[PDB]
Write a protein that binds this ligand. Structure first.
Ligand SMILES: *[C@@H]1O[C@H](CO)[C@@H](O[C@@H]2O[C@H](CO)[C@@H](O[C@@H]3O[C@H](CO)[C@@H](O)[C@H](O[C@H]4O[C@H](CO)[C@@H](O)[C@H](O)[C@@H]4O)[C@@H]3O)[C@H](O)[C@H]2NC(C)=O)[C@H](O)[C@H]1NC(C)=O
Ligand SMILES: *[C@@H]1O[C@H](CO)[C@@H](O[C@@H]2O[C@H](CO)[C@@H](O[C@@H]3O[C@H](CO)[C@@H](O)[C@H](O)[C@@H]3O)[C@H](O)[C@H]2NC(C)=O)[C@H](O)[C@H]1NC(C)=O
Ligand SMILES: *[C@@H]1O[C@H](CO[C@@H]2O[C@@H](C)[C@@H](O)[C@@H](O)[C@@H]2O)[C@@H](O[C@@H]2O[C@H](CO)[C@@H](O)[C@H](O)[C@H]2NC(C)=O)[C@H](O)[C@H]1NC(C)=O
Ligand SMILES: *[C@@H]1O[C@H](CO)[C@@H](O[C@@H]2O[C@H](CO)[C@@H](O)[C@H](O)[C@H]2NC(C)=O)[C@H](O)[C@H]1NC(C)=O
Ligand code: A1IO9
Ligand code: CL
Ligand code: CL
Ligand code: CL
Ligand code: CL
Ligand code: CL
Ligand code: CL
Ligand code: CL
Length: 842
């Protein structure tokens, strides 16, 4: 009866340290573990009972009744269960209080079979194809109290990913792991709640099938994993709103999840270029020198950034008349050179200036845009400018005011996007200047494992008021709501695609904005940790993600910055950013051989931009990932499941970086197939013929291993110091043949920044096909945007025998080279991407 296998013991004292007497008083078992809870539920612990189950066209409804109270206050004894079979792939169920509207996240919204346990109550979801049990909520009691919801399930395996934002391996440890979702300003460190919260997991099943679970709940929560294996959702409010996505492919699970929360926004092409920033570019002169120094040293740079330096007394929508007197001229110059400009914006608005002295506050105050406290005044905290109020991005008037402030500032300085920092929201003091009241929201009955042990730590009072609800319910949305507000602000101000990079995020963030991983240390550990974190954000539908290249905190080393630039060049969002007291880490600040390695990394990224842009097109229209783990592409190969120090770009490009000091080789996993060394493509084995195995590759300091998968064609474009320049260059194809002489690839092209391109059909889509010693294009769509793209080079990999002749459209080509050593046929052509062509050899 208390004979429960240790791994299957669910914690009956998650709220407090408990004694054997108190444990047995709750009706629970007390056995010290030989981590595993000492106080755990017997199989007979009171749960809810399923009653009055009925079927309809939509699905199932029932009453859940609890007869015996839990040890939490304000149990809701009568619940309503609603099970909705929404699509062949998507099962949706809610557990609500039929007597009272409870807080619900404001979001726009067969392969499975379902059965129920009566007592204790449980929802059971099978995969129809194989009968396997994916969800089973019968494993532990259902808790549904006003400020404590708990729902548990068996997991189909020890392999589960998601539940951002945390510094951890891509596959979460099931050894009694507590994962806390409570947006918190803190330098990434293991076991801590970080800047964002994504209550979604993808679970692998034996044989490489997978399913996803989304809990649509924005309250502070713990998610507890145990090695049985099983999971417990423990939220501090709202309702249980659960989506199950049946896959069966992991990539299909992600796409199914993004169907609900939104497909990733399409970035502007210039956004995929190199970004350079630091805190400490203290003048326009200094900032101009950065661009001059990069250009002088032949380093590509699309976007020049500034941190707090530009502001007047660290206030939004101002610039100082000292070092930044000619701010408008500097940004206009950047535009004249073909570059874009980004600057930091904080959420908090300085409240200390005399009335009428600082328009953002004076206007915000008048229009009631700010989060208000117990006595109905603006909540005042402390951030960079001093005393600040915090905008309420759930208030329609705050959205109008934010659009107005962005538009007015844009009329003075025409910035090309917004870097939105400190939007947890971050507070330099606890709660407010005036502290926080003593109520159940500030002092809840269950406090998740947050750093500082309070919901108020490094943020604003939980009982503060927003237009939609209390901060208690909306805190984990704050960053997301600012990203939506800023997305709209930039569309109205500029009339082209917005570019928003946000620190704080929630599920569905990728539909509006991108993300950077925050204040990472300049360390080999943080370089390695950035790979799983960038992969995690792609799975969560935020493909536009990166870490500060060479690290933010402390001083980078020349070797670290070389390796970090090499890997960082494969971040979908590539920015080098640096702290105020740090040594310079711009590419031009290093030795000649280091610069050479960093220039080579940047050159290769720029060459690949047409490919990377096409991958973002697939993310935007089909909910695909851009940077993906090997297990998303080869899920039926179980050796990929734990790989998170390699990444793919889409299906085809395998990046195997060095992540350790003093290494001149690296060992990476190579799924079954032929992998051609990308170094054999003009811009050490020529080809790795893998059975599905680990392979040691040479990797001197000037090298990063990149391999192109046999069966794939990649589009490339010639060099430039900006995408303004690069987008005008001739293009090339890299054609990686299967042993059987086949390959496939694609190109998406548009003007690179207009809104509603897909709706208006203002794009070109071309498919490339290799077969039987031929390469053709298929024209899916050709418009003015793309029709004049010049193809001048076709490189074919895995050409076994030297050709006697190479033909372009039936005519011998002007020039070609064949290397018998590397099996590479390099062909010079004069073709248009938008006109049907046929290249052949024999
Ligand atoms: C909700 O937010 C509002 C701000 O939007 C906040 O108002 C603040 O209230 C405190 C008092 O509660 C104000 O502080 C006072 O300032 C005046 C004038 O400078 C002082 O004279 C007051 O001093 C008295 O109290 C001191 C305690 O140390 C004593 O030392 C002294 O002898 C006085 O007896 C006091 O410091 C503060 O100015 C406002 N803030 C603003 C911007 O107006 C309100 O408190 C918040 N409500 C809740 C319940 O938190
Ligand atoms: C969903 O999860 C629940 C709980 O984990 C599963 O129900 C439990 O199944 C166990 C193992 O079969 C049952 O214990 C067994 O009971 C029989 C007597 O009926 C005994 O002979 C065995 O030695 C064993 O102890 C247990 O009664 C049952 N628990 C509850 C609370 O009902 C269930 O199987 C899962 N559903 C699916 C479809 O996997
Ligand atoms: C990061 O490095 C700076 C600067 O260090 C100095 O200059 C470099 C080029 C290199 O030659 C170093 O060996 C030098 O020490 C550090 O700033 C220094 O901090 C100490 C202590 O406050 C002070 O005595 C030095 O004079 C400072 N130099 C300057 C220019 O301010 C900084 O502390 C380093 N940070 C970390 C985390 O290691
Ligand atoms: C851009 O490069 C110039 C030239 O390398 C930098 O100016 C030099 O700065 C060093 C200190 O690092 C001084 O010793 C020299 O006096 C400067 N040389 C010249 C030729 O002026 C400048 O700091 C760089 N600016 C930025 C922002 O990187
Ligand atoms: O705008 C400044 C900045 C760094 C702040 C670092 C700091 C914070 C508090 C005390 C001292 C330093 N904010 C936080 C951002 O993560 C980082 O990229 C920025 O450079
Ligand atoms: Cl035991
Ligand atoms: Cl007992
Ligand atoms: Cl108790
Ligand atoms: Cl969408
Ligand atoms: Cl102040
Ligand atoms: Cl909203
Ligand atoms: Cl389309």
């Amino acid at each position: 009866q208390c004979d429960v296998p240790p791994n299957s013991r669910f914690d009956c004292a998650p709220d407090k340290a408990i004694t054997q007497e108190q444990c047995e008083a709750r009706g629970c078992c007390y056995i010290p573990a030989k981590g595993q809870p000492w106080c755990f539920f017997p199989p007979s612990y009171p749960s809810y009972k399923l009653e009055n189950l009925s079927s309809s066209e939509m699905g199932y409804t029932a009453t859940l009744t609890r007869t015996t109270p839990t040890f939490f206050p304000k149990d809701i004894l009568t619940l309503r269960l609603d099970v909705m079979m929404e699509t062949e792939n998507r099962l949706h169920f809610t557990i609500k209080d039929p007597a009272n509207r409870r807080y619900e996240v404001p979001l726009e919204t067969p392969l499975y079979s379902v059965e129920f346990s009566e007592e204790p109550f449980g929802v059971i979801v099978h995969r129809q194809l194989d009968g396997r049990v994916l969800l089973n909520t019968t494993v532990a009691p259902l808790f549904f109290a006003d400020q404590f919801l708990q729902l548990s399930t068996s997991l189909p395996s020890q392999y589960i990913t998601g539940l951002a934002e945390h510094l951890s391996p891509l596959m979460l440890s099931t050894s009694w792991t507590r994962i806390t979702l409570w947006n918190r300003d803190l330098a990434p460190t293991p076991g801590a709640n970080l800047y964002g919260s994504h209550p979604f997991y993808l679970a692998l099943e034996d044989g490489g099938s997978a399913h996803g679970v989304f809990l649509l709940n924005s309250n502070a929560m713990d998610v507890v994993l145990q090695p049985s294996p099983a999971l417990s959702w423990r939220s501090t409010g709202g309702i249980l709103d659960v989506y199950i996505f049946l896959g069966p492919e992991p990539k299909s699970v992600v796409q199914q999840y993004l169907d609900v929360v939104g497909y990733p926004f399409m970035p502007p092409y210039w956004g995929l270029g190199f970004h350079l920033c630091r805190w400490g570019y203290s003048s326009t002169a200094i900032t101009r020198q950065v661009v001059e120094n990069m250009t002088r040293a032949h380093f590509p740079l699309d976007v020049q950034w500034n941190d707090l330096d530009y502001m007047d007394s660290r206030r939004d929508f101002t610039f100082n008349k000292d070092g930044f007197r000619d701010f408008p001229a500097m940004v206009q110059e950047l535009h004249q050179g073909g570059r874009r400009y980004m600057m930091i914006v904080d959420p908090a608005i300085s409240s200390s200036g005399p009335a009428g002295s600082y328009r953002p506050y004076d206007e915000g105050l008048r229009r009631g845009v700010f989060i208000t406290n117990e006595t109905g005044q603006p909540l005042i905290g402390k951030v960079w400018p001093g005393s600040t109020a915090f905008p309420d991005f759930t208030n329609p008037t705050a959205l109008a005011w934010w659009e107005d402030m962005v538009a007015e500032f844009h009329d003075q300085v025409p910035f090309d996007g917004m870097w939105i920092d400190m939007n947890e929201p971050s507070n330099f003091i606890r709660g407010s200047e005036d502290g926080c009241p003593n109520n159940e929201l500030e002092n809840p009955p269950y406090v998740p494992g947050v750093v500082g042990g309070t919901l108020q730590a490094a943020t604003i009072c939980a009982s503060s008021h927003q237009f939609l609800s209390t901060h208690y319910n909306l805190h984990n949305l704050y960053g997301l709501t600012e990203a939506i507000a800023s997305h709209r602000a930039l569309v109205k101000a500029r009339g082209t695609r917005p570019f928003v990079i946000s620190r704080s995020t929630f599920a569905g963030h990728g539909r509006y904005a991108g993300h950077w991983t925050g204040d990472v240390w300049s360390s080999w550990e943080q370089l390695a940790s950035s790979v799983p974190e960038i992969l995690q954000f792609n799975l969560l539908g935020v493909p536009l993600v990166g870490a500060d290249v060479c690290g933010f905190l402390g001083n980078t080393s020349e070797e670290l910055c070389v390796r970090w630039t090499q890997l960082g060049a494969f971040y979908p969002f590539m920015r080098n950013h640096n702290s105020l007291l740090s040594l310079p880490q711009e590419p031009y600040s290093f030795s000649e051989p280091a610069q050479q390695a960093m220039r080579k990394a940047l050159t290769l990224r720029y060459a690949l931009l047409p490919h990377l842009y096409t991958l973002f097109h697939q993310a935007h229209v089909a909910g695909e990932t851009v940077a993906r783990p090997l297990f998303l592409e080869f899920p039926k190969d179980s050796s990929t499941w734990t790989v998170d120090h390699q990444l793919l770009w889409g299906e085809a490009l395998l990046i195997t970086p060095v992540l350790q000091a003093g290494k001149a080789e690296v060992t990476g996993y190579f799924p079954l197939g032929t992998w051609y060394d990308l170094q054999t493509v003009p811009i050490r084995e020529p080809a790795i013929h893998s059975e599905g195995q680990w392979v040691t590759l040479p990797a001197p300091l000037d090298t990063i291993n990149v391999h192109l998968r046999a069966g794939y064609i990649i589009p490339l474009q010639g060099p430039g110091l900006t995408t303004t320049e690069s987008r005008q260059q001739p293009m090339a194809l890299a054609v990686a043949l299967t042993k059987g002489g086949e390959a496939r690839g694609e190109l998406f092209w548009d003007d690179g920044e207009s809104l509603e391109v897909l709706e208006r059909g203002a794009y070109t889509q071309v498919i490339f096909l290799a077969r039987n010693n031929t390469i053709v294009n298929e024209l899916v769509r050709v418009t003015s945007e793309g029709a004049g793209l010049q193809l001048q080079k076709v490189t074919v990999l895995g050409v076994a025998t030297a050709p006697q002749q190479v033909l372009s459209n039936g005519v011998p080509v002007s020039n070609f080279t064949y290397s018998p050593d590397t099996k590479v046929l390099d062909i010079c052509v004069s073709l248009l991407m938008g006109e049907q062509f046929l290249v052949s050899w024999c």
